[model samples]
Target chain A: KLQPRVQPSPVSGPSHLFRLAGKCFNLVESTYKYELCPFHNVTQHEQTFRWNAYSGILGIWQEWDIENNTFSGMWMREGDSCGNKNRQTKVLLVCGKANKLSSVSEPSTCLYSLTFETPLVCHPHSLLVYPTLSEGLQEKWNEAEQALYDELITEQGHGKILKEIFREAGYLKT
Target chain B: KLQPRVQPSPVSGPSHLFRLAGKCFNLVESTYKYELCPFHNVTQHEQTFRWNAYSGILGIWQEWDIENNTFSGMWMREGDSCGNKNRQTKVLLVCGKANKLSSVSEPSTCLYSLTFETPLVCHPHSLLVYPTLSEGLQEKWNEAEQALYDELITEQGHGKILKEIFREAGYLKT
Candidate 1:
């Protein structure tokens, strides 16, 4: 008998965080300079620039293109504020198009958001705190990103993501 | 007295394939339509999409970003082809901006590239093929991704990477 085999669920168990580290851009004048731009200004205007985030994992992920050099995505993480305790938070990162200038006096500010996936883990810990993790994760993630970028430049080919690279090395289980 | 930590030497490794799945449109439009306009279209226009290879524990992994819609990332499964293998083979799901359209009509044409990372084990097969114990390992990875996603959603925070998540879950050795 040729019975159709049931496909196993793509994911399993309780969800955890999956950090996404990469470069993004904020739009700026085509003639924008690089030396004076944020963090070394090593990017061109209206071009893809470097940015990284440690976005928390969720059921299915969703992203929104807000246009005019802006996009938004949802993730799970804790939020922080001066005096807010009861409210839950969810984190988001909004990036703008890159500006190309010798020195960028004013670069657009990237937006971030926070939301909750489940009930508050603890009453005081808001979801917005996820952004803090973003800061820590970015440091390690950037190290990985630099490795990938160097390969892209040296090999003259597009870059790979950290996960795929691990999978290929047989470090990944599936 | 604490000694300064020494960084490991950088090395090159395998590349990961990134799959892009979704659509986008001009936000100003009252009704989003799938047309051949520079701003909107249904086909897999290579120009508007981007991907980078990443290196993790095993090998290289691919990451994707769609210019117009929500962006998502996934690890390419070992042995899966990015349109180069069998015609019927598809390794990723379509989830991103403009994903509303039927995948049947407009399939995602993903991209690939190689990335570099510090080499772990040197065996080429261990670096390339699915090991005999891979199925079991994959089950664990899938569960990890899901669990992370769930936790992130519950807390409205981004999930941690599988390795870190496993460590927190007491599944892996420190």
Candidate 2:
């Protein structure tokens, strides 16, 4: 059906890094970076294809634009010979499990930019979504923020009950 | 600059499954299906998005079509409702972690079909990619794999050297 499940909200470059925490893959032409931890929480929802996550591609200049699904940043050309210290790079990503990097171009000398088909963009490891009753109870009012969450079944009175429980709790006020 | 990384050959469905073997997820509109082990191997790569792994969507029609990515099979009806012993259904899927079922259409009465964007589709929890040289010589082979892993000039030569090493090993007819 070419239909995509587990569609998720756009994630920050850091959050995306969380999902790729425990994976191992080669970088374009070489080297295997293995073992990344805390590979859970946040990311995934409302999208089919996403970005590729790279361990070496991080350090400074954390710019994440969820709208464009783009991440621009810089990297430290660690322990070697290079034109400069921190090599600047920008990253763009899409979904799919191919573990592919779309491009690797050095825009300016020493600085760089890249793109990715990071398959993890579509999968958020957990879905413990719950509406808050604190606002209603505290009298702050029914502040059940309709923040769309991943893995929620908003179908056939199914999710309604959960929502109501949160609503009733919220009705209490802060 | 947009330079891509890690360009490998096309992988089979079973390989993808191996990547997702130890993860768990919650299907919206219903329940949490945990522990989908040894989720079956085969299919995927191109399209068709079939379903052989049911630990994520188990308890139903077990027919898997590696060709069409279609699993039009039988599922037992459960929990107080529905008729018949075996209810038929169809399933399709693709890479991406969302664990989304693109389609939840019913081809027949009490029959089902769906798709997924499993998060692990992009992340392989473990990477013990052992192709085997021999029980006694396995450690040696791993050492060999790492030996060919990095750059030179101590830098360019760093990753470059190791890459060449693995490249040379693969050049063999094993």
Candidate 3:
């Protein structure tokens, strides 16, 4: 008898980042402006001097880099050359509130990685979420505020308990 | 003849991140909330069940990690431990528009790195800045915009010139 085999989930295309297709984001550096159009291309525009303006393709869209069945990043290849090696770019996606090209760095000659931040990568299972206030805590907070006012009005400075509070809150030693 | 000696700049304290002092930033993870008070302490609070509340200091204010007279990061030491080793945390400073605790990660059992972002570290001489628009380009843009409108009104789609534009903008082959 043959044991049942578990079917792997279908490999979905890089659909999350496709929402950024045709939309361009620009980061202006000292002498160059880096432009990125997700799933399309990457470019560098020179602004050294008037009439010395030039632009060059850093990379063209190739494909998404998948690792261990997860969409990791996008690769753009066959860019301008640096000596004998052709340029290439990798865009790494990270979680953030908005779609942005956060940072660009060249690790080696003609090899670049652009840190791209977007909510698209923020899965609920992996991302931190703020917890909702409970009704019990809401009532307790009102009583705590009254207690705080009394502690202040007495001018005791409440030094001892204040330290205890800090200790409990992780500011002081236990 | 006696040779003259060069004087090194005075060691300035980590004053850039002092702006974040007294301000507590929080990051809520799955079961715990991490809090950071710059130049003070780092803490983790448990949020598993009601009345099971607890908090522990991850680390305490120690010193700044300086390199060549530059402040690189802050160190918090003598935290609660995992086993034989006591916990410690390193807070790395980076340039950003706002003061934020961007991330918290533990590479080992209890060692932590908290990436802190603040505008204080954004020295104008080092950070990338957007260039000012020239008066010449301001006027030229008006004319070019009109040309763009004309190119679009005509049903030609201006396929040939469009490709040229893409090429010049670094999205296509040069």
Which candidate has the highest TM-score of all?
A: 3
CAPRI band for model 2? incorrect
Predictions ranked by lDDT, top down?
A: 3, 2, 1
Q: Estimate each model's TM-score.
A: 0.15, 0.22, 0.33
Preferred candidate (TM-score higher): 1 or 2: 2
Two-chain DockQ for each candidate model: 0.01, 0.02, 0.01
> Candidate 2 residues B55-162, lDDT tens each?
222232222332211222212222112445433334444444355544354576545554555543332211112221122233333333333332114434434433
How well is each residue in A1-174 modelled by candidate 3, as lDDT tens digits? 111122212222433344577798988888888988876678888878567587667776665554422456777777776779767889888866578888899998789998888766654212111011122332232233344554543324434443333233322223
Model 2 residue B94 lDDT? 44
Clashes of each: 88, 71, 0
Q: Candidate 1's error at B79, in angstroms?
A: 56
Give the CA lDDT, 0 to 100, for residue B159 in model 1.
34
Show where candidate 3 strays beyond 4 Å: A1-12, A124-174, B1-174
RMSD of 3: 27.4
Candidate 2 off by > 4 Å: A1-17, A22-24, A28-63, A66-85, A122-174, B1-174
What candidate 1 gets wrong by more than 4 Å, as runs, is A1-5, A10-117, A120-144, A148-159, A163-174, B1-174
lDDT against the true structure, per candidate, is 0.25, 0.31, 0.57
Candidate 3: residue A59 lDDT (0-100): 78
CA displacement after TM-score superposition, residue B168 of candidate 1 (Å): 18
